[PDB]
Design a protein around this ligand. Structure first.
Ligand SMILES: C[C@H](Cn1ncnn1)Nc1ncc2cc(Oc3ccc(F)cc3F)c(=O)n(C)c2n1
Length: 347
């Protein structure tokens, strides 16, 4: 049956949650809502509870709310954030206005681990292996993260990693000298073309380099500065890639730049494992068609000690036909409500 709910004011709003969740404490903002840490007395777990802010404010908001719930409900993988619970205090569709999402509370993100310092090669292997294992799963369901960065990669004390915020930033927060843009594939940063899953592999390359050196790979001061930093490392595009830039304006800008050859990665990443260098070379390819995939990267010799083809699962089919569907607010809201009430908690 329905649990008993209790009320509490936390992040400028009244949080109404089942009794099972105790000791609620603000821990910052998440995607499209604020997060509280809590103790789940039913499971004995420390949990993160996110209350979405104005989930049904507009069509865009309502569809976004449905999207996140659909994504979280589908993900059942060790290296991907999953849904422990989803609830509403509402007793019917007509009273339904708030959505609460519950997941594992994670101790630290990759920003906290890096802390301006180099990690050991074995630590890099294990961390990057888990990101790729998670990405293989996500990509197998035709989901693209689109915004992988250290701040959405979370880790427990044993360095077991989970990927947060997949499949979901404004122009302002992408402006200037900001970590929000440093990990983005050039094709999405400058809207060169219809992009796909390979954008995420670029992001892994940027993250892996930073784990190895303790420094941001492409810390651009703006979009243009960042492109110049990228092209200095990987070389300016060839005729083959240029043709694929469907944006006439973006392609015309590219051709104005003085040509530069790809640099020697062994001279860039001094002292690094030669196998790490080789992998970086295969991830940080400008033409996205030619980047190593997650499944291929798991088989690369760098992960020899972690790779197990029988323990790198793929996802069940994910129906996202809703993405091309035009609906009214109340219709997105009703779809969302159905998904809330039909939720079954994990083992
Ligand atoms: C490292 C990071 C921050 N932190 N808080 C306490 N200690 N470290 N931990 C953490 N754990 C879980 C989430 C969940 C987050 O979002 C959610 C996603 C899905 C969900 F069901 C519930 C959520 F709260 C989130 O946005 N952040 C930033 C998180 N951070």
């Amino acid at each position: 049956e329905r649990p008993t709910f209790y009320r509490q004011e936390l992040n400028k709003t009244i949080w109404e949650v089942p009794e099972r969740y105790q000791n609620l404490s603000p821990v910052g903002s998440g995607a499209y809502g604020s997060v509280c840490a809590a103790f789940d007395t039913k499971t004995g777990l420390r949990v993160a509870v996110k209350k979405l802010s104005r989930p049904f404010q507009s069509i865009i908001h309502a569809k976004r709310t449905y999207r996140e719930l659909r994504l979280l409900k589908h993900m059942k993988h060790e290296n991907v954030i999953g849904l422990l619970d989803v609830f509403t205090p509402a007793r019917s569709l007509e009273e339904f206005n708030d959505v609460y999402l519950v997941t594992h509370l994670m101790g630290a993100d990759l920003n906290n681990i890096v802390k301006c310092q180099k990690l050991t090669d074995d630590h890099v292997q294990f961390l990057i292996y888990q990101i790729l294992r998670g990405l293989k799963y996500i990509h197998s369901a035709d989901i693209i993260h689109r915004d992988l960065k250290p701040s959405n990669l979370a880790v427990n004390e044993d360095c077991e990693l989970k990927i947060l915020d997949f499949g979901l930033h404004t122009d302002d927060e992408m402006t200037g000298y900001v970590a929000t843009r440093w990990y983005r594939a050039p094709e999405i940063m400058l809207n060169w073309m219809h992009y796909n899953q390979t954008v995420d592999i670029w992001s892994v390359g940027c993250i892996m380099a930073e784990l190895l050196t303790g420094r941001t790979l492409f810390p651009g001061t703006d979009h243009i500065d960042q492109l110049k930093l990228i092209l200095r490392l990987v070389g300016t595009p060839g005729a083959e890639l240029l043709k694929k830039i469907s944006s006439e304006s973006a392609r015309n800008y590219i051709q104005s730049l003085t040509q530069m050859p790809k640099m020697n990665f062994a001279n860039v990443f001094i002292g690094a494992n030669p196998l790490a260098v080789d992998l970086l070379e295969k991830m940080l390819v400008l033409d996205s068609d030619k980047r190593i995939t997650a499944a291929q990267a798991l088989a690369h010799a760098y992960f020899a000690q972690y790779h197990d083809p029988d323990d790198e699962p793929v996802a069940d089919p994910y129906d996202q036909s809703f993405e091309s569907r035009d609906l009214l607010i109340d219709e997105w809201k009703s779809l969302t409500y159905d998904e809330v009430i039909s939720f079954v908690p994990p083992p």
